[PDB]
Design an enzyme around this catalytic site. Sequence first.
Site, PDB file in Angstrom:
ATOM      1  N   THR A  84       0.816  -1.209   0.000  1.00  0.00           N
ATOM      2  CA  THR A  84       0.000   0.000   0.000  1.00  0.00           C
ATOM      3  C   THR A  84       0.859   1.273   0.000  1.00  0.00           C
ATOM      4  O   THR A  84       0.799   2.080  -0.933  1.00  0.00           O
ATOM      5  CB  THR A  84      -0.947  -0.047   1.200  1.00  0.00           C
ATOM      6  OG1 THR A  84      -1.670  -1.281   1.192  1.00  0.00           O
ATOM      7  CG2 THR A  84      -1.942   1.121   1.168  1.00  0.00           C
TER       8      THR A  84
ATOM      9  N   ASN B 237       5.407  -1.656   3.708  1.00  0.00           N
ATOM     10  CA  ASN B 237       4.513  -1.170   4.748  1.00  0.00           C
ATOM     11  C   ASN B 237       5.186  -1.169   6.117  1.00  0.00           C
ATOM     12  O   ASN B 237       4.665  -0.538   7.045  1.00  0.00           O
ATOM     13  CB  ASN B 237       3.233  -2.002   4.789  1.00  0.00           C
ATOM     14  CG  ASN B 237       2.184  -1.536   3.773  1.00  0.00           C
ATOM     15  OD1 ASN B 237       2.292  -0.453   3.181  1.00  0.00           O
ATOM     16  ND2 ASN B 237       1.146  -2.349   3.588  1.00  0.00           N
TER      17      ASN B 237
ATOM     18  N   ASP C  99      -9.830  -3.246  -1.087  1.00  0.00           N
ATOM     19  CA  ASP C  99      -8.735  -3.925  -0.392  1.00  0.00           C
ATOM     20  C   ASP C  99      -9.213  -4.536   0.912  1.00  0.00           C
ATOM     21  O   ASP C  99      -8.892  -5.687   1.225  1.00  0.00           O
ATOM     22  CB  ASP C  99      -7.585  -2.954  -0.112  1.00  0.00           C
ATOM     23  CG  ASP C  99      -6.375  -3.638   0.527  1.00  0.00           C
ATOM     24  OD1 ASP C  99      -5.646  -4.367  -0.180  1.00  0.00           O
ATOM     25  OD2 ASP C  99      -6.151  -3.464   1.747  1.00  0.00           O
TER      26      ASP C  99
ATOM     27  N   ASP D 295      -3.803   1.204  -6.564  1.00  0.00           N
ATOM     28  CA  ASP D 295      -2.417   1.068  -6.146  1.00  0.00           C
ATOM     29  C   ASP D 295      -1.843  -0.329  -6.390  1.00  0.00           C
ATOM     30  O   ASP D 295      -0.626  -0.456  -6.550  1.00  0.00           O
ATOM     31  CB  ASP D 295      -2.235   1.477  -4.673  1.00  0.00           C
ATOM     32  CG  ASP D 295      -3.033   0.621  -3.693  1.00  0.00           C
ATOM     33  OD1 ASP D 295      -3.861  -0.200  -4.128  1.00  0.00           O
ATOM     34  OD2 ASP D 295      -2.817   0.781  -2.454  1.00  0.00           O
TER      35      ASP D 295
ATOM     36  N   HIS E  14      -1.648  -9.222  -0.979  1.00  0.00           N
ATOM     37  CA  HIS E  14      -0.861  -8.663  -2.072  1.00  0.00           C
ATOM     38  C   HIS E  14       0.563  -8.415  -1.582  1.00  0.00           C
ATOM     39  O   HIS E  14       0.868  -8.538  -0.384  1.00  0.00           O
ATOM     40  CB  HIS E  14      -1.491  -7.376  -2.579  1.00  0.00           C
ATOM     41  CG  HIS E  14      -1.658  -6.377  -1.498  1.00  0.00           C
ATOM     42  ND1 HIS E  14      -0.627  -5.575  -1.071  1.00  0.00           N
ATOM     43  CD2 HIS E  14      -2.709  -6.104  -0.696  1.00  0.00           C
ATOM     44  CE1 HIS E  14      -1.049  -4.814  -0.079  1.00  0.00           C
ATOM     45  NE2 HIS E  14      -2.307  -5.122   0.170  1.00  0.00           N
TER      46      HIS E  14
ATOM     47  N   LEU F 151      22.427   2.478 -12.075  1.00  0.00           N
ATOM     48  CA  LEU F 151      23.135   3.395 -12.951  1.00  0.00           C
ATOM     49  C   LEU F 151      24.483   2.807 -13.311  1.00  0.00           C
ATOM     50  O   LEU F 151      25.118   2.143 -12.487  1.00  0.00           O
ATOM     51  CB  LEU F 151      23.337   4.757 -12.293  1.00  0.00           C
ATOM     52  CG  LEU F 151      22.059   5.275 -11.647  1.00  0.00           C
ATOM     53  CD1 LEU F 151      22.360   6.515 -10.821  1.00  0.00           C
ATOM     54  CD2 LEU F 151      21.023   5.559 -12.720  1.00  0.00           C
TER      55      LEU F 151
HETATM   56  O1  LIG Z   1      -5.097   8.352   3.549  1.00  0.00           O
HETATM   57  C1  LIG Z   1      -4.264   7.519   3.150  1.00  0.00           C
HETATM   58  C2  LIG Z   1      -3.238   7.871   2.166  1.00  0.00           C
HETATM   59  C3  LIG Z   1      -3.622   8.228   0.845  1.00  0.00           C
HETATM   60  C4  LIG Z   1      -2.645   8.559  -0.066  1.00  0.00           C
HETATM   61  O2  LIG Z   1      -2.898   8.930  -1.354  1.00  0.00           O
HETATM   62  C5  LIG Z   1      -4.263   8.962  -1.719  1.00  0.00           C
HETATM   63  C6  LIG Z   1      -4.294   9.817  -2.973  1.00  0.00           C
HETATM   64  C7  LIG Z   1      -3.636   9.215  -4.176  1.00  0.00           C
HETATM   65  C8  LIG Z   1      -5.138   9.351  -4.115  1.00  0.00           C
HETATM   66  C9  LIG Z   1      -1.279   8.558   0.262  1.00  0.00           C
HETATM   67  C10 LIG Z   1      -0.313   8.905  -0.709  1.00  0.00           C
HETATM   68  C11 LIG Z   1       1.015   8.895  -0.384  1.00  0.00           C
HETATM   69  C12 LIG Z   1       1.404   8.537   0.927  1.00  0.00           C
HETATM   70  C13 LIG Z   1       0.478   8.196   1.881  1.00  0.00           C
HETATM   71  C14 LIG Z   1      -0.900   8.196   1.566  1.00  0.00           C
HETATM   72  C15 LIG Z   1      -1.897   7.852   2.508  1.00  0.00           C
HETATM   73  N1  LIG Z   1      -4.287   6.222   3.643  1.00  0.00           N
HETATM   74  C16 LIG Z   1      -4.900   5.826   4.928  1.00  0.00           C
HETATM   75  C17 LIG Z   1      -4.478   4.376   5.187  1.00  0.00           C
HETATM   76  C18 LIG Z   1      -3.726   3.890   3.923  1.00  0.00           C
HETATM   77  C19 LIG Z   1      -3.718   5.053   2.932  1.00  0.00           C
HETATM   78  C20 LIG Z   1      -2.419   3.707   4.745  1.00  0.00           C
HETATM   79  C21 LIG Z   1      -2.069   2.239   4.982  1.00  0.00           C
HETATM   80  N2  LIG Z   1      -3.093   1.837   5.973  1.00  0.00           N
HETATM   81  C22 LIG Z   1      -3.854   0.672   6.065  1.00  0.00           C
HETATM   82  O3  LIG Z   1      -4.648   0.643   7.023  1.00  0.00           O
HETATM   83  C23 LIG Z   1      -3.675  -0.524   5.213  1.00  0.00           C
HETATM   84  C24 LIG Z   1      -4.543  -0.659   4.094  1.00  0.00           C
HETATM   85  C25 LIG Z   1      -4.466  -1.745   3.244  1.00  0.00           C
HETATM   86  C26 LIG Z   1      -3.486  -2.720   3.563  1.00  0.00           C
HETATM   87  N3  LIG Z   1      -3.145  -3.935   2.935  1.00  0.00           N
HETATM   88  N4  LIG Z   1      -2.131  -4.494   3.643  1.00  0.00           N
HETATM   89  N5  LIG Z   1      -1.808  -3.741   4.681  1.00  0.00           N
HETATM   90  C27 LIG Z   1      -2.628  -2.635   4.645  1.00  0.00           C
HETATM   91  C28 LIG Z   1      -2.726  -1.518   5.497  1.00  0.00           C
HETATM   92  C29 LIG Z   1      -3.225   2.960   6.926  1.00  0.00           C
HETATM   93  C30 LIG Z   1      -3.177   4.180   6.016  1.00  0.00           C
HETATM   94  C1  LIG Z   2      15.148   7.541 -10.102  1.00  0.00           C
HETATM   95  O1  LIG Z   2      15.011   8.949 -10.032  1.00  0.00           O
HETATM   96  C2  LIG Z   2      15.775   9.569  -8.988  1.00  0.00           C
HETATM   97  C3  LIG Z   2      15.557  11.057  -9.130  1.00  0.00           C
HETATM   98  O2  LIG Z   2      16.142  11.528 -10.337  1.00  0.00           O
HETATM   99  C4  LIG Z   2      17.257   9.191  -9.063  1.00  0.00           C
HETATM  100  O3  LIG Z   2      17.778   9.505  -7.779  1.00  0.00           O
HETATM  101  C5  LIG Z   2      18.784  10.528  -7.732  1.00  0.00           C
HETATM  102  O4  LIG Z   2      20.036  10.005  -8.118  1.00  0.00           O
HETATM  103  C6  LIG Z   2      21.175  10.883  -8.017  1.00  0.00           C
HETATM  104  C7  LIG Z   2      22.387  10.026  -8.322  1.00  0.00           C
HETATM  105  O5  LIG Z   2      22.484   8.911  -7.442  1.00  0.00           O
HETATM  106  C8  LIG Z   2      21.273  11.549  -6.637  1.00  0.00           C
HETATM  107  O6  LIG Z   2      22.207  12.623  -6.696  1.00  0.00           O
HETATM  108  C9  LIG Z   2      19.927  12.088  -6.169  1.00  0.00           C
HETATM  109  O7  LIG Z   2      20.031  12.497  -4.810  1.00  0.00           O
HETATM  110  C10 LIG Z   2      18.859  11.008  -6.298  1.00  0.00           C
HETATM  111  N1  LIG Z   2      17.568  11.499  -5.842  1.00  0.00           N
HETATM  112  C11 LIG Z   2      16.653  10.716  -5.263  1.00  0.00           C
HETATM  113  C12 LIG Z   2      15.365  11.387  -4.868  1.00  0.00           C
HETATM  114  O8  LIG Z   2      16.851   9.523  -5.069  1.00  0.00           O
HETATM  115  C13 LIG Z   2      17.462   7.696  -9.305  1.00  0.00           C
HETATM  116  O9  LIG Z   2      18.815   7.416  -9.638  1.00  0.00           O
HETATM  117  C14 LIG Z   2      16.563   7.200 -10.426  1.00  0.00           C
HETATM  118  N2  LIG Z   2      16.731   5.772 -10.625  1.00  0.00           N
HETATM  119  C15 LIG Z   2      16.998   5.233 -11.814  1.00  0.00           C
HETATM  120  C16 LIG Z   2      17.160   3.742 -11.841  1.00  0.00           C
HETATM  121  O10 LIG Z   2      17.124   5.914 -12.811  1.00  0.00           O
HETATM  122 CA   LIG Z   3      26.172   1.794 -10.540  1.00  0.00          CA
HETATM  123 CL   LIG Z   4       5.813  -4.912   3.877  1.00  0.00          CL
HETATM  124 ZN   LIG Z   5      -4.085  -4.538   1.457  1.00  0.00          ZN
END
Ligand SMILES: O=C(c1cc(OCC2CC2)c2ccccc2c1)N1C[C@@H]2[C@H](C1)[C@H]1CN(C(=O)c3ccc4[nH]nnc4c3)C[C@@H]21
Ligand SMILES: *[C@@H]1O[C@H](CO)[C@@H](O[C@@H]2O[C@H](CO)[C@@H](O)[C@H](O)[C@H]2NC(C)=O)[C@H](O)[C@H]1NC(C)=O
Ligand SMILES: [Ca+2]
Ligand SMILES: [Cl-]
Ligand SMILES: [Zn+2]
Length: 805
Positions: A159, A180, A261, A308, A420, A689
Amino acid sequence: WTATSGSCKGRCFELQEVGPPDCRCDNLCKSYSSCCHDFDELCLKTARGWECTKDRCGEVRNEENACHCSEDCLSRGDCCTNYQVVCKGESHWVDDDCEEIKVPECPAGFVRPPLIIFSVDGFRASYMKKGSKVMPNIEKLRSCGTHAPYMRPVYPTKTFPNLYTLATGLYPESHGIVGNSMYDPVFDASFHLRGREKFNHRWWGGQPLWITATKQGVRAGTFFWSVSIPHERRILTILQWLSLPDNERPSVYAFYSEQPDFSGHKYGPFGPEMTNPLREIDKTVGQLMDGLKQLRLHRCVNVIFVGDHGMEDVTCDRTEFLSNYLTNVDDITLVPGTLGRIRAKSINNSKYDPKTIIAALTCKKPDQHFKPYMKQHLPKRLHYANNRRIEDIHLLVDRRWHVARKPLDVYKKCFFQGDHGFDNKVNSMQTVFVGYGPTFKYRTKVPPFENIELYNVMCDLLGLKPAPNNGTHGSLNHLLRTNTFRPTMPDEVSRPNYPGIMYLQSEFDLGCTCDDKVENKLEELNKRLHTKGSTKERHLLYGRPAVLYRTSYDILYHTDFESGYSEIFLMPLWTSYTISKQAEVSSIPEHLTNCVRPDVRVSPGFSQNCLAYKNDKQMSYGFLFPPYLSSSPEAKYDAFLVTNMVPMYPAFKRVWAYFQRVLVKKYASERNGVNVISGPIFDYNYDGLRDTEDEIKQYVEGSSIPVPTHYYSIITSCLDFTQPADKCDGPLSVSSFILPHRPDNDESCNSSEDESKWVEELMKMHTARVRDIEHLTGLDFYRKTSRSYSEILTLKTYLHTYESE
Ligand SMILES: O=C(c1cc(OCC2CC2)c2ccccc2c1)N1C[C@@H]2[C@H](C1)[C@H]1CN(C(=O)c3ccc4[nH]nnc4c3)C[C@@H]21
Ligand SMILES: *[C@@H]1O[C@H](CO)[C@@H](O[C@@H]2O[C@H](CO)[C@@H](O)[C@H](O)[C@H]2NC(C)=O)[C@H](O)[C@H]1NC(C)=O
Ligand SMILES: [Ca+2]
Ligand SMILES: [Cl-]
Ligand SMILES: [Zn+2]
Ligand code: NA
Ligand code: NA
C-alpha cells in the site's frame, strides 16, 4: 499535548493545518487525536443522511443536517449530491449519454481544469471487466475516457510503497517507503502502521505532487483522510472546496478508498462478498460526478480513477516456515508475508553469516514456494536494492503463498483469504487506470504502463514542472488530448573513432592462437567494403546508440555485426546485428574452438589478452556477436576477434550459449527477423546506474578487464510481423533482458537439467525495459527511426512480462 478547548466553527476541514497546542480541524486531526472538542459536532454532521428526498426539496435550511436540499444550498455549495435530480428534475451523470469533451467547459474564474485523483486500494485490474455490470459510473468513466487494460504497480505491491510512488514518480528505493514496514539502521527507528513514527517526515523522500504543486503556486487539497471520516463526507468536502473563492480554491484533489482492499483480504479477490464493496465504490464515484454536474464542473475537471495494486488468493495453510529450513531461526529478524526480508537479530552476533542463510534456503524442498536472493541479485526490473532500509537478504514469494518465521507466528498474531505484495509483473497484482476530462482522450484505449509514469502526467495536467523522478517524461503523451510535453533527444556526449588497419599481427602479444592462416581479388574488394561499413544498414537498423558520457570508444564494422568498442573497458559497450527469418545456425568448427584473433584496428594496449583467462581458473570468456550465427565460413572469423570477446563465468556461458545458439534463431523465425543489440553492464553498487571505471570491484585476475555484473540484449522487430525486421515501415516491437552475470546457476533449481528446461525461464524472470538498460549503460537507443519520439519513448518503457490473460 493538545488543548482541545478551541473551536472549529467556520474552520471545518481547513486547508492550512495548525500546530499544537492549537486544536486542529483538518481532515487528518483524528489520526493525531488532535481535533477541537466540537469537530464531530460541527464538521461530521450525520443528520438526515446523504441523499435528498422529495419532501426535503425547498426545505428550510437546517444547519444540523449532513447536507442540504434547501433552495439556497447551491450558492452555499453544500447540497446533497443528488439534490438537482430529486428537486430540479435533472438526471444522474451516469444516465447521460457519453459526449466528447473537446474543450474545457469551466465556469468563470477557473484558471485551469482541476485534477481529482480517485484512488482505490486493492482494485485488481480484472475488476474493470468482471465487475462492469455492478459499477455503472466507473464503466462510463472507463469507456468514455482514456483507459489502460491494467497499470503495473511497483514492487513490493504494497500500500504505502505504491501510494507514494503514484505521488512522486519514484521507485520505492528512491522515495524511501520500501514496505509497509521498515527498519532504518541509521536512525535506529521503525516504521509501522501502528504508531506515530510513520507520521515523521524523515521517512518520505523525493517530492510528492502536493509539495510540487504548492512550491509552484498551485493549491492542493490535503490528500489524506482519517479512516473514520465517511466517504460521503469526503466527497462533499471536496465539492465544498471546489466552491471556494478563486484565490482560495485548490486545483488538485485526492480521494482515497480503503475498499475493495479491506474486503479482498477477508474474502479473497473474487469472493461473493465482493460485489457490494464494488457497488459502493461505484456509488461514491456516482456522487462525485453528480456533485460535479451540480457545480457545472463535469466537463471541466480531469478525473483519475487509479488503483495502487491488485489482490491474490492467499490462505494461512499456504505458508512456508523458515523454522523448517534453518536451525537457529531465532538468530534472525524476518519481515514476513508476501515478501521476506531477513537481517540479524542482534548486531553483536559474529556467528551471523548471510551466506549460510542463503544456502540453507536454496532449492531445499522439491516445490518450495519462495526463492532467496541477495538484493543486488534481484531482477533489475524491480529496482529494489539501493536503500539502507532494504535488508541484504530478500525472499521472492510465489503468488498465493506467505513466508513466516515459526508456525506460532501464524496462529498467535483460519483468518484471511486475500493478500498482495508479490512481484509486480504478476497478473493478480496489476491494477487500474482511467482518465476522464477535457485533457484526456475520448474513447481511447492505451497499452498497459507503469505507475511511476503518472507523476509526470499529473504535472502536465496541472501545469507543473516535475521534480526529478523515474518516469520517462513524454512516454504517456498518447493519453492526452493536449498539454503534451514534447521532449528533445539527449545530445551525444562522446563521438566515436572510426579506426582503420593500424597495427600488425606481430605487435600483439596476447597469448591467443587461431587455426586461421589457411587463407582472391574477385571478392577481396568485397571484404574491404565490409570493414568500412558497406552492410551497416542491415545491422544498425535504428541508428547507432549515443554515448551520453565522456569516454573513448571506436566503431568497428563487420560483415555480420557492428560494435561500439570501449578502450576504457576493453570490450564493446554494445554489439548490433540483424538475423532474418532465413538465417541458418552453424557450429563452431572443430579447428576454431579456442580461436581468438587480434584486431588490427585496436592497439594491443587497448585489447584483452587470452593469458589472463588461462590464469584465472574461475573466469572464461564469451562472444557478443555469436559465432553460431555467422553468414558464411569466411565471415565467422570475425566473430573470434579479441574485440568481440567478454568475460564470462562457465556457469553463465551455459546460459549465454543457449541464448545465442537456440533462442535468437527461435525469435528470428517467430518474429520475422530480429535485430539484437547486446552488451555488458557494470552495476557494482546496485543503484541501477552505469558504474564508472573506479567503481568496478572485480577484474579478470591479473588484468584490467573489468567483469560485468550483468549482460543485456535488446531484441527488436516489426510490430506487424508480416514485414521483416529489416524492412519495417511502422511501429516497432521489443523485448529485452538484463541477465545477472553469476558464477553459479543456484537461482535456477533445475539447472542440472538441459538448458531447454530452465534457461529461458531465467531470461523471462529477468526481462527488462530498454529504459532500464539505458540507465545501466549511459546509452541512448532508437536515435534514427521513422517513428515519433513520443512513440519511441513508450517503446523504451515497454516491458514484456510473459503473463497470460
Ligand atoms: O489516507 C491515506 C493515504 C492516501 C494517499 O494517497 C491517496 C491519494 C492518491 C489518491 C497517500 C499517498 C502517499 C502517501 C500516503 C498516503 C496515505 N491512507 C490511509 C491508510 C492507507 C492510505 C495507509 C495504509 N493503511 C492501512 O490501514 C492498510 C490498508 C491496506 C493494507 N493492505 N495491507 N496492509 C494494509 C494496510 C493505513 C493508512
Ligand atoms: C530515479 O530517479 C531519482 C531522481 O532523479 C534518481 O535519484 C537521484 O540520483 C542521483 C544520483 O544517485 C542523486 O544525486 C539524487 O540524490 C537522487 N535522488 C533521489 C530522490 O533519489 C534515481 O537514480 C533514479 N533511478 C533510476 C534507476 O534511474
Ligand atoms: Ca552503478
Ligand atoms: Cl511490507
Ligand atoms: Zn491490502
Ligand atoms: Na579458464
Ligand atoms: Na541449480
